[PDB]
RNA sequence: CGCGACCUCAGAUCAGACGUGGCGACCCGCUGAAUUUAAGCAUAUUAGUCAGCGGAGGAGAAGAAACUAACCAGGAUUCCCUCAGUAACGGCGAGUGAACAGGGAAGAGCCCAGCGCCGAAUCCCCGCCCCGCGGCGGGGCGCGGGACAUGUGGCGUACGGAA
RNA sequence: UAAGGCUAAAUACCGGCACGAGACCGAUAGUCAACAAGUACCGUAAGGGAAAGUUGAAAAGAACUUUGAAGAGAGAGUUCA
RNA sequence: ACCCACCCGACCCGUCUUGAAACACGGACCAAGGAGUCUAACACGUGCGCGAGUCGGGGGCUCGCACGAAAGCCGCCGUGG
RNA sequence: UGGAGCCGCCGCAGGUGCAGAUCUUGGUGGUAGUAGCAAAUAUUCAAACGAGAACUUUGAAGGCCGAAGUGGAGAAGGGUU
RNA sequence: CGACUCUUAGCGGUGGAUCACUCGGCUCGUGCGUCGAUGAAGAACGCAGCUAGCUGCGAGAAUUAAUGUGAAUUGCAGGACACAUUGAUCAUCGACACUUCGAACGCACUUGCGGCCCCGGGUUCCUCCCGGGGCUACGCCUGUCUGAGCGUCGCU
């Protein structure tokens, strides 16, 4: 787990935020390795990974990345959309498909949060006052 | 301080070329609109920006 | 003279001396507070200073 | 602010009831010469052109 | 003591010019701005003083190149031709 | 008097460095005079000495930049100077050719299945 | 009333627009008309005026009928010298009166072959609007 | 404080509204936009209705709207099957389909195969070259009309 | 005690490529208070909000159901109206608080892996010729190199597909 | 029908380029900023941060005499003023 | 309405305060600026339109908007409240 | 006086009326020709220049700092002094 | 009457209110929606005949070329040009050019040290010396070369 980086405990502030240990962060450990993969390779863009094996202290993952600029991706239409600069670092956005998880977006009823494209969206549509011409 | 660096010697002598006051040809000039340079400067009140 | 402050002393001296046909003996710079790199160039006995003064334009 | 409520928003019956009264007061002429329109050597007051 | 008669012994200083930002801000122990970060590669700014980010940002300066990109833009961004000569 | 580029784009390239150079002279000569007092007369000259400078300088630059994109023309690896600046990204664009490739499957659905031009009501 | 949606009808913004104009538009708008002599022969009815086109005051003090050239034109001030417009300092020196060139009127021009083409466009597009109003 | 008689009330005005508050200014100019973009894009599909496919009939759901009837997102598998229409041809034609839908009910089934047997007929198919083949429709239906149709094709009327 | 395959791994100012910082109104991903309210205050609230870090594009994100429903049933996402200040949550206090259905804007759908068949039918790169060449592309021709069976390409993907 | 993936469109937009408009403000207002303003200046630094618009249609901006070392005036003049 | 004269009357305003001319606080002078707003939500009153209805939004149709980012219209007229 | 715009009526709209807030900005009085220009012994005579000299310069006299200096030289700092 | 004081008015000052202006803001709307190793943003230092600042530009430095425009610029000079000529000046901007720091890139931040290839003087490849030119960042991808290992095997 991630404790919390605070200075001794010294969360100031009410006794809520308190927590230094027991508590979790959001994306997983697959969406970590993606994410550091990616980060120093940054002229390669992921494409996605896989879980390899673990031991206590580790987990280890082999996150597949494509050089989008190597004609044989360039060239082939069914891979070139990688190429686009939109899908530069998907693993930074959240759009791998261990990125994608932690966002927790999915259709149907146990979802609701997340009902725009994502989580803040959701948020925003539903805390903007729509305050209209003629009310 | 007599032990200059290049940098700051350089930094210094734009400043004291900048000083000069105003050409008096400029104020028969047809939009006008300045008297005086303003931002002059004087070595015993205001001390640069070191 | 009044010199460009990117120059040694080198290249002074072979610049005076392509453009005046003229021996240097030994340059000698400084800079003035101002941003003028100014070069005190000693010529070669055998030639004059006062001559080639009057040659280039100021006296 | 921006969101100060500018417009105002009106039925439509009344609109047009309202409508009605400057088309009937459009005839009526004391009230057209009241309106300070000089209308003295008009013919007749719904003052209607051949087209 | 503590007051004026201390401010004598201003002899020395802390910083210095930077040379990524031309303010006086370069601390020389540390070795790093205060403005910008110097040695540190991203350009320090904060979200908290808004007056601070409006004092440089791309406007603030001359745009030696995105101001004539964005003349270059606007009719085109044609590239080796020229104008039918007379 | 007065150079004007019109006329230097056809000399020769030894030509166009001696003029620039009878030029350069020229200026150096000035701005001893303007040194020396001289006269107005001359200190009009030192700025039409500089813009004729640069104007010899300039067509000379052309001239041998033509040239070497009339070389380097075809070359599939050119120089960064000589190959075009459009924009970082518009450089890394898909590469006309490349966008409008297909794949043999939509090809093959552009040919069985394509959209028909059509009316409705008679 | 206007009715193109790119044009403006805001003091300040024609204002700006006339007194940071640049000279080249500023020849536009420091034109003058042409005197009824010319309007008739040329089928003009105004020109850009310039260094030496003899010309007559209309309104002001100089108003008169005597046709001076221009002596020149000094398109910073918006403003013609004309030849004999001029007033004494109170150290005797003669100064040109500045003129505003819309307050005078054309008498002679003074043609070279782009002038002369100016005046066959201007010519040329009036007789298509009388052909298009026929 | 309260003051003798009247709703007890909580409105929601503790979170900083006025940071996200959404004013309506735009609306007309977006009225002006859309229909520019409707306008333009009936002008770019020339004779085919500018409404957009043929779209099938539809019960609403649950026992409220049970009674009424809308537009469908695209006719069923087996309507198209039963009106002699090849899935991927429907596409161009002008007819909406929707492979996610059921059929339960031999009726509605009946019902939208109706409405394609009745679509296809009052349809004015062009031809691919002007050089005709079979098909495509003659050339009395297609100068008599190059015609739109404004307004949803086939209006679904309850 | 050599020579050779491969494997894993190094070094090169080796050939050609690409990432690096900025801007940040809008967008995505984390991180995340406390003033404040509750007439005190600790859960709650302020708020997943300010500040912090990361990464984008002309938009982003989302998206072609492990959906809603329970009906005579609808049929990707987004957006507006409505649902609804409702169901629900809450020292059931203060406060919070959606969703389907209905009407609208728009509307567009698809491809792999797999399972199988096709002499790898595929790809990248070098060199000569013709065209074209300021978004390096088309055709031809080389016992010229590599990648590829630890699996490239066509067919096909759940609406079923192959023979 | 999950644990692989691509997808325009309505939607967003206090930054940018460029336009239009306003029952807005009218130089203590309106942006900190109508002007050589993020300027001067302050602070080691982060940072803070102003003031400041208006002769006249035209410079015709007061030649010349006179008093005074001059600043200053007295006359004279320009100006519709 | 300017000054002056005399008779009578007459304490300095603002404020909190049971009580202020107070030995209560603010106020040397003058100019300009300066404080119950706007949105939402209810309530009651009142005016108008329609009436077992009413309703307009949101959308759509009518134009390049000069006035129009209006105005008009809609089996959407009623999804819906 | 000034020198370019302004008002009555009927309606609509509001950033609509100031003595105070130790209110904000600017300006001005009384105080007041007042408090003050008193740390470290010291000035004088002549001459010059000059419109003009208690103070400038030259000479003379009398004085002080009294080589841990009120002398000569540097560091830091200043930035043309 | 005297001086002073107070009051009122007239004229003077002081000060900048008022009013009238407005190449500025503020707001709403529309259309585009573009930066960067081909060196961005930003910084520095430079550049005018007389120029301090603002602005504009980069040692070709108040701008070169090209196109369009068609006689200026103008504070004063001084000049050009034949304005019956690629032609003043403006505008546009497609060609050319764009000093030093800066992601900043040979290593260092002193402007301090360097390496390796090519040229000119210097030699007569004699290395020195000077000057010039071109390379010399990190990370990463495809290939290339050279290699490593009691890694897995093959033949000798
Ligand atoms: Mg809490
Ligand atoms: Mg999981
Ligand atoms: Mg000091
Ligand atoms: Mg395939
Ligand atoms: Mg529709
Ligand atoms: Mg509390
Ligand atoms: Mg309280
Ligand atoms: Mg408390
Ligand atoms: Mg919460
Ligand atoms: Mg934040
Ligand atoms: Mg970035
Ligand atoms: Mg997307
Ligand atoms: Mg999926
Ligand atoms: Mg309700
Ligand atoms: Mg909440
Ligand atoms: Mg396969
Ligand atoms: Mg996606
Ligand atoms: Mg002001
Ligand atoms: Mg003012
Ligand atoms: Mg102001
Ligand atoms: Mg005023
Ligand atoms: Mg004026
Ligand atoms: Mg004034
Ligand atoms: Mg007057
Ligand atoms: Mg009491
Ligand atoms: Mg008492
Ligand atoms: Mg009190
Ligand atoms: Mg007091
Ligand atoms: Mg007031
Ligand atoms: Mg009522
Ligand atoms: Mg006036
Ligand atoms: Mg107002
Ligand atoms: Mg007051
Ligand atoms: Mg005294
Ligand atoms: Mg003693
Ligand atoms: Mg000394
Ligand atoms: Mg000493
Ligand atoms: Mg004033
Ligand atoms: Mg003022
Ligand atoms: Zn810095």
Not at chain 1, 16 to 25: C, E, I, M
Not at chain 5, 7 to 32: D, E, I, M, V
Not at chain 7, 47 to 70: A, L
Not at chain 8, 25 to 32: L, M, W
Request: glycine share 6%; net charge positive; charged share 35%.
């Amino acid at each position: 787990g991630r404790k919390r980086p605070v200075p001794k405990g010294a969360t100031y502030g009410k006794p809520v935020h308190h927590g230094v240990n027991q508590l979790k962060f959001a994306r997983s450990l697959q969406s970590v390795a993606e994410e550091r993969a990616g980060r120093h390779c940054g002229a390669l863009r992921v494409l996605n990974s896989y879980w390899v094996g673990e031991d206590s202290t580790y987990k280890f993952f082999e996150v597949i990345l494509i050089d989008p600029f190597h004609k044989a991706i360039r060239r082939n239409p069914d891979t070139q959309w990688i190429t686009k600069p939109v899908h530069k670092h998907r693993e930074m956005r959240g759009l791998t498909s261990a990125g994608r998880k932690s966002r927790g977006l999915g259709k149907g009823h146990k979802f609701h949060h997340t009902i725009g494209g994502s989580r803040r969206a959701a948020w925003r549509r539903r805390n903007t006052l729509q305050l209209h011409r003629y009310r | 301080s007599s032990h200059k660096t290049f940098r700051i010697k350089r930094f210094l002598a734009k400043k004291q070329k900048q000083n000069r006051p105003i050409p008096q040809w400029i104020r028969m000039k047809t939009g006008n609109k300045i008297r005086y340079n303003s931002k002059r400067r004087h070595w015993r009140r205001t001390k640069l920006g070191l | 003279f009044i010199v460009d402050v990117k120059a040694n002393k080198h290249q002074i001296k072979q610049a005076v001396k392509k453009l005046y046909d003229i021996d240097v003996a030994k340059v000698n710079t400084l800079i003035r507070p101002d941003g003028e790199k100014k070069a005190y160039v000693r010529l070669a006995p055998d030639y004059d200073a006062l001559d080639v003064a009057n040659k280039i334009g100021i006296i | 602010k921006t969101w100060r409520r500018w417009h105002r928003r009106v039925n439509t019956t009344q609109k047009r009831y309202a409508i009605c009264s400057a088309l009937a007061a459009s005839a009526l002429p004391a009230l057209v010469m009241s309106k300070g329109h000089r209308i003295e050597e008009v013919p007749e007051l719904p003052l209607v052109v051949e087209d | 003591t503590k007051g004026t008669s201390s401010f004598g012994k201003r002899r020395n200083k802390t910083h210095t010019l930077c040379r990524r930002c031309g303010s006086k801000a370069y601390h020389l122990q540390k070795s790093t701005c205060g403005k910008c970060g110097y040695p540190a590669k991203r350009k320090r700014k904060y979200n908290w003083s808004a007056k601070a980010k409006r004092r440089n940002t791309t406007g603030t300066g001359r745009m030696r190149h995105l101001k004539i990109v964005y003349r270059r833009f606007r009719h085109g961004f044609r590239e080796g031709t020229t104008p039918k000569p007379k | 008097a007065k150079i004007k580029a019109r006329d230097l784009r056809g000399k020769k390239k030894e030509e166009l460095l001696k003029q620039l150079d009878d030029l350069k002279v020229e200026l150096s000569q000035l701005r001893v005079a303007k040194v020396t007092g001289g006269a107005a007369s001359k200190l009009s000259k030192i700025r039409v000495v500089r813009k004729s400078i640069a104007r010899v300088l300039t067509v000379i630059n052309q001239t041998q930049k033509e040239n070497l994109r009339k070389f380097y023309k075809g070359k599939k690896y050119k120089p960064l100077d000589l190959r075009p600046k459009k924009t970082r990204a518009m450089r890394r664009r898909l590469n006309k050719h490349e966008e409008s490739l297909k794949t043999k499957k939509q090809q093959r659905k552009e040919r069985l299945y394509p959209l028909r031009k059509y009316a409705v009501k008679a | 009333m206007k009715f193109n949606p790119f044009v403006t009808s805001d003091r300040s913004k024609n204002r700006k627009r006339h007194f940071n104009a640049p000279s080249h538009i500023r020849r536009k708008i420091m034109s003058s008309p042409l005197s009824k002599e010319l309007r008739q022969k040329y089928n003009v009815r105004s020109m850009p005026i310039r260094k030496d086109d003899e010309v007559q005051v209309v309104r002001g003090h100089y108003k008169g009928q005597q046709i001076g050239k221009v002596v020149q034109v000094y398109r910073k001030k918006y403003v013609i010298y004309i030849e004999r417009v001029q007033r004494e300092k109170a150290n005797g020196t003669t100064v040109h009166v500045g003129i505003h060139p819309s307050k005078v009127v054309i008498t002679r021009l003074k043609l070279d072959k782009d002038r002369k083409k100016i005046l066959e466009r201007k010519a040329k597009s009036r007789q298509v609007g009388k052909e298009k109003g026929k | 404080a309260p003051s003798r008689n009247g709703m007890i009330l909580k409105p929601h005005f503790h979170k900083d509204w006025q940071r996200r508050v959404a004013t309506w200014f735009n609306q007309p100019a977006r009225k002006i936009r859309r229909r520019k973009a409707r306008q333009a894009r009936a002008r770019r599909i020339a004779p085919r209705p500018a409404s957009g496919p043929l779209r099938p009939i539809v019960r609403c759901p649950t026992v409220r709207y049970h009674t009424k009837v809308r537009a469908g997102r695209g006719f069923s598998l087996e309507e198209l099957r039963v009106a002699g229409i090849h899935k991927k041809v429907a596409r161009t034609i002008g007819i909406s389909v929707d492979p996610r839908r059921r059929n339960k009910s031999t009726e509605s089934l009946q019902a939208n195969v109706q409405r394609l047997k009745e679509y296809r007929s009052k349809l004015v198919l062009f031809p691919r070259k002007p050089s005709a083949p079979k098909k495509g429709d003659s050339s009395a239906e297609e100068l008599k009309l190059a015609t739109q149709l404004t307004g949803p094709v086939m209006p679904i009327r309850n």
